[PDB]
Design a protein around this ligand. Structure first.
Ligand SMILES: [Mg+2]
Lengths: 208, 217
């Protein structure tokens, strides 16, 4: 009924065979399919959720799965694919907030039935995104503010704002959180109302 | 057909998707094998002139709109079904003053789940897929949003209130002069998630955010 997985530096063809053994689905794999994969889920996944993870891994490495009666065809169109369990926030709400941190070479997908996220990126950027998810995770909804920077640079702005909050220089902002969205040079500011409203003012003061 | 404008324009209405694929092959020189299951009627429109690479982006948006994708199968490119109303138009909307990426989160609440929305940053254009009457309505929203100097925004997830009521009260109060301090700010309802998107200059936006919180008490 449920499965976990810990596959490290395995041929993508082994991962396909392991999905066939788990799900019972048989695949006809195009000769051009190739690559090394690392796939991890410490969370228990249902048969349907294992299939969603399979699609995310295929998409991560540039492969499409096409219906073909009974069997399905795998065809072309180091990264680890990890399943991250979210405890309190709805996963579909966190997706847009985490997408900025995922590079264009990566993958990000929701698994709403397990309240989990699937991410593909280098192992070190996943661990950094895991900490962001852990800080975001909460029962209440995330109201937020977006600031499109005109003069400053978001990775610098995010570091200054984080440093000021950690050192006690951002009085009133304690508890607020900032997510840098480097693709569009914008900041996403979260947190409880008073703290969030103050961090928006500090961020705005920085882009003058 | 694609009409020279090397740039082109296009205004294809109610054509077989297979005709649209053949036209893309004639312009791009790319040869495709179309899986027997690929079917449908398409309307594709660009009054803006598109380069060769932008015509290819429009092609991908049309394929994705109708549930198709391009794969490599047996030494050739194959268009296949990937894992909605009968009449969908795919229109390119050029944006004049604002960077297109900044308008995308403000117009996404208006694109339904069957639709499509993609950026074409090299032409500063948006590709939208929807019913022709719905696209015209979104084109007016883009024209109004594009005249604004800032596209910074605040999001409020309403826990108690109904989204459409809150938006109407806030708009009425701003139009009647009752939202002191928030004049100049604007509201976009996002029903799918029962949330408000508040825009405007910083202080007015900060005041409309406070006013919006009083309606969800
Ligand atoms: Mg095999």
């Amino acid at each position: 009924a449920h499965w976990t997985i810990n596959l490290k530096d395995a041929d993508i063809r082994e991962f396909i065979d392991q999905i066939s053994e788990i799900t019972g689905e048989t695949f006809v794999v195009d000769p051009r399919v190739k690559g090394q994969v690392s796939v991890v889920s410490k969370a228990q996944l249902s048969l349907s959720e294992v299939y969603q993870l399979f699609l995310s891994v295929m998409s991560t490495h540039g492969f499409t799965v096409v219906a073909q009666g009974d069997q399905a065809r795998i065809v072309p169109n180091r990264l680890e694919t990890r399943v991250i369990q979210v405890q309190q926030s709805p996963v579909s709400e966190l997706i847009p907030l985490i997408r900025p941190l995922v590079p264009q070479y990566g993958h990000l997908a929701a698994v709403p039935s397990a309240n989990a996220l699937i991410i593909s990126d280098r192992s070190a950027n996943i661990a950094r995104i895991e900490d962001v998810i852990r800080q975001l995770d909460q029962k209440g909804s995330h109201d937020y503010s977006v600031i499109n920077l005109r003069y400053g640079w978001v990775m610098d702005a995010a570091e200054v704002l984080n440093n000021a909050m950690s050192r006690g220089q951002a009085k009133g902002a304690a508890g607020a959180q900032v997510i840098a969205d480097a693709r569009t040079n914008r900041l996403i500011i979260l947190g409880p109302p008073q703290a969030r409203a103050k961090l928006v003012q500090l961020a705005q003061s920085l882009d003058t």
